[PDB]
Symmetry: C2
Subunit: 108 residues, 2 copies
Amino acid sequence: KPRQKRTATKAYNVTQAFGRRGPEQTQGNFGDQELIRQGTDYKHWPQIAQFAPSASAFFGMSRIGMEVTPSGTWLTYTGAIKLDDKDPNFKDQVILLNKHIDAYKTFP
Amino acid sequence: ASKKPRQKRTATKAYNVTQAFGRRGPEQTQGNFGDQELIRQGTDYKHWPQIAQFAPSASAFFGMSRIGMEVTPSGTWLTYTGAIKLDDKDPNFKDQVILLNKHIDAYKTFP
C-alpha cells in the first residue's frame, strides 16, 4: 500500500508502516512507545484522530508543493490546525499531544 | 457542513473550497491548492479521486508528519509538515504530476 494510505495497528505497527521516530525532517516525530506499538488500536487513538484532516481539508488547508529530489518526486505539505479552546476536553487534548510529540527522545 | 471542525470539513459544490477553507493565497498558513474548477466543486470535482489518492489516512498523517504545538494570541495550534512520494513506476505518474501542478498556486492567475 502507498505509505500515505497505510493504517498502523498492533499487527502492522507505526515503525513497520511509517519508520522509526526521529529528529530528521524526513522522519515522523509523533508517538510514545504505546502508540507506536498499537497504532489505531491505541486507547486514545480517537482523541488523536480528531485532529487529522479529511482528504478535502488536507488539500484545502495545507500549503502544497512539489519537489524533485534524488529519491523521487514528492508532494510536500505544511499547515496548522487550531484546537478549540471552548472544548471541555481541551486540557486533556494538550496533555495527550504533549505525551506524543517528540516522545522518542526519552525512549531507552 | 460548516459546523464541523475545519480539519473535518468536506468541500462540495454547495459548500465550496473557499467557504470551507478560505480563499487561496500566499500566506504562511493559508491554503494554496486549487484552480477555479476545483475551488467551486471540491470533492464533486470529476478528477477528485486522482487528487485524493495522495491525501493521508489519519494513521499516516500522524505517522509520517512532523507534528508540533504552538500557543499564540489566537489559540493553540497543531502544526504539521511532511512529504509524500509519488510512485514514478506508475504508468500514470506523468499525469499525476500534471494534475497536482495544475492546482498548486493556480490562484495566482485569477482574481
